[PDB]
Amino acid sequence: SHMTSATIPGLDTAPTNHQGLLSWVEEVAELTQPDRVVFTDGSEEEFQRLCDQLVEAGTFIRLNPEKHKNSYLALSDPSDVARVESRTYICSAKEIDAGPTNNWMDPGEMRSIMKDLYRGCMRGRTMYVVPFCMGPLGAEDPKLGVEITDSEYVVVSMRTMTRMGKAALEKMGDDGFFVKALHSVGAPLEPGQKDVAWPCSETKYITHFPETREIWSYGSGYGGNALLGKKCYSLRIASAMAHDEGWLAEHMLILKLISPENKAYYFAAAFPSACGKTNLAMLQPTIPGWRAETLGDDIAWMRFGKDGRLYAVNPEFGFFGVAPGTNWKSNPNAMRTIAAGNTVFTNVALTDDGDVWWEGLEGDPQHLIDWKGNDWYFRETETNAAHPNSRYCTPMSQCPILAPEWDDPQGVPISGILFGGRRKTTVPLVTEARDWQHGVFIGATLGSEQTNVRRDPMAMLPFLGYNVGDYFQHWINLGKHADESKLPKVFFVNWFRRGDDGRFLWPGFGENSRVLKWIVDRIEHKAGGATTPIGTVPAVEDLDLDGLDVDAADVAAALAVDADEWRQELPLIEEWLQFVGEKLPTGVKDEFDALKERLG
Numbered sequence: 199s200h201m202t203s204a205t206i207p208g209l210d211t212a213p214t215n216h217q218g219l220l221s222w223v224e225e226v227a228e229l230t231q232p233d234r235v236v237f238t239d240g241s242e243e244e245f246q247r248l249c250d251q252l253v254e255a256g257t258f259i260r261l262n263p264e265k266h267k268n269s270y271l272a273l274s275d276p277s278d279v280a281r282v283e284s285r286t287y288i289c290s291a292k293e294i295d296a297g298p299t300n301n302w303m304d305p306g307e308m309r310s311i312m313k314d315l316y317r318g319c320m321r322g323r324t325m326y327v328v329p330f331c332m333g334p335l336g337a338e339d340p341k342l343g344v345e346i347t348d349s350e351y352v353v354v355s356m357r358t359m360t361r362m363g364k365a366a367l368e369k370m371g372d373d374g375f376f377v378k379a380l381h382s383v384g385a386p387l388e389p390g391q392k393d394v395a396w397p398c399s400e401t402k403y404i405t406h407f408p409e410t411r412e413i414w415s416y417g418s419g420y421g422g423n424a425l426l427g428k429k430c431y432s433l434r435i436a437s438a439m440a441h442d443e444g445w446l447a448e449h450m451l452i453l454k455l456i457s458p459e460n461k462a463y464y465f466a467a468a469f470p471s472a473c474g475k476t477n478l479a480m481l482q483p484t485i486p487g488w489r490a491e492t493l494g495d496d497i498a499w500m501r502f503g504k505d506g507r508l509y510a511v512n513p514e515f516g517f518f519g520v521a522p523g524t525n526w527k528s529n530p531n532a533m534r535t536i537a538a539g540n541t542v543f544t545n546v547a548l549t550d551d552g553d554v555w556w557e558g559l560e561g562d563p564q565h566l567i568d569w570k571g572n573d574w575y576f577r578e579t580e581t582n583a584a585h586p587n588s589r590y591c592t593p594m595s596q597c598p599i600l601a602p603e604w605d606d607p608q609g610v611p612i613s614g615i616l617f618g619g620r621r622k623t624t625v626p627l628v629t630e631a632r633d634w635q636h637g638v639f640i641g642a643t644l645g646s647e648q649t650n651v652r653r654d655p656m657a658m659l660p661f662l663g664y665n666v667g668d669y670f671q672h673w674i675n676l677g678k679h680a681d682e683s684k685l686p687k688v689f690f691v692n693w694f695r696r697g698d699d700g701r702f703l704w705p706g707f708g709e710n711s712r713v714l715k716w717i718v719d720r721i722e723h724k725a726g727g728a729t730t731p732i733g734t735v736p737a738v739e740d741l742d743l744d745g746l747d748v749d750a751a752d753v754a755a756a757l758a759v760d761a762d763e764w765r766q767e768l769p770l771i772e773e774w775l776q777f778v779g780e781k782l783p784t785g786v787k788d789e790f791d792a793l794k795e796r797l798g
């Protein structure tokens with residue numbers, strides 16, 4: 199029954215221009231034994247064809263086209279609802295090169311385990327070969343990939359999340375380099391066996407081989423486990439490339455802010471989860487003459503341009519956002535983007551009229567079907583209607599405030615890099631770094647509230663493709679060798695400081711634009727601030743609070759730098775720097791010492 203690649207259907211009609219790709223596809227098909235092989239072209243006719251099959255398989259139902267044209271709801275297996283960090287591996291030749299923020303295993307051992315799993319794993323299934331491009335195709339060195347997958351769901355979402363298909367394949371030419379990304383849901387089928395809507399396995403690996411730029415995923419069909427451009431390529435493999443090639447692959451939103459001068463400023467901002475970064479990516483300023491547009495709300499790739507400035511590009515093509523919490527009052531621009539359809543929803547609730555719902559959304563629906571397919575009732579059912587990690591997957595191009603520069607292969611010049619976290623105490627509403635190296639330290643020690651303070655350096659804690667210490671050194675190296683006058687200024691923002699009584703000291707949301715105005719003015723040298731031990735921090739009088747009904751004492755409190763509180767912060771930072779291990783750069787330890795000395 200085992201078939202040689204040459205006789206596997208679809209391989210006789212395979213594209214032959216690129217021999218390395220073809221040989222690789224043949225090797226893989228020979229191992230996994232799919233029923234047939236399909237090279238995807240990313241066309242609209244292909245998209246509707248795959249969707250028809252997804253509807254037939256029960257993976258998708260078609261949402262009411264009158265509310266979301268060309269849109270679908272998928273409900274997953276309850277065991278497969280999120281990225282699985284403990285099953286995610288960086289398999290560098292040496293463990294130290296994975297480092298303490300990563301899960302390591304010897305690459306020889308990992309390959310032996312996974313190749314065993316892959317043997318015959320696609321029996322009964324179509325194997326798709328999915329070419330794609332991370333970033334605009336017109337780029338200089340475009341980052342190409344090919345995902346092999348046995349998941350039709352994966353193919354369709356990859357079409358939205360990356361520039362997938364014909365164009366990317368042609369960009370590969372006849373011998374062009376590309377990231378080899380392999381994926382299987384690990385649910386082989388017998389001939390004639392009825393499949394399930396959402397195949398997956400209890401056994402999962404999301405493995406990265408940094409030296410060869412390869413990704414091997416098995417067992418999950420969900421999000422960042424299976425859409426291999428999303429985190430695997432965009433951050434983990436890309437950070438390794440960026441390390442070797444002198445650029446930065448980062449977990450940052452990209453915001454375009456326009457002043458009453460009609461001058462545009464571009465910012466890259468890194469937050470961990472639970473800091474409302476999507477709200478910031480799609481900011482609507484509350485002060486006259488200021489406007490904002492978005493270039494992305496997840497990944498930014500930054501590279502020096504001819505003029506010595508850092509330019510950011512969004513390597514992705516779609517939004518893959520967390521649904522719950524998204525609503526008209528807090529994020530009308532996200533809702534408008536979703537309203538235009540072409541969206542795949544995963545694990546949200548279904549309304550009686552074929553619309554969708556999730557916790558946080560307006561409407562008070564009286565009855566819903568929940569993410570497990572069961573009846574749900576307003577003010578009665580005690581389980582969430584949508585899964586807390588449910589998703590919408592939507593084209594970026596239909597966002598109403600998308601900046602026209604979004605698809606420019608050169609990217610946009612970055613004036614400011616922002617780091618942020620949630621802190622009840624200690625950390626001011628906004629701080630500017632003293633210089634680049636201080637800024638690196640500010641990013642490297644990014645703290646955010648956990649169940650107590652979790653350190654999530656540059657918001658990259660679960661996403662680095664190599665040693666966190668070397669990563670800090672890389673940041674240090676890029677600044678050292680740059681024109682200092684051209685580097686982005688670095689800031690730390692905390693929208694979430696609280697009074698002792700638990701009040702929010704800063705109203706946030708749209709009012710965050712007032713902080714961004716200060717940031718713009720600082721960049722233009724048009725604003726002052728206090729020189730504190732932790733950096734430059736504005737006083738209330740430095741901020742534009744005009745038109746804002748707020749207690750000035752609350753804003754002063756949000757901006758305070760208390761030396762006692764920061765002396766208590768020091769051993770927390772010190773413990774983290776020790777955890778960074780032997781690769782902790784001296785330049786980062788220097789900034790710790792300098793901060794400790796300035797505090798006294």
Ligand SMILES: [Mn+2]
Pocket residue numbers: 449496
């Ligand atoms: Mn993310």
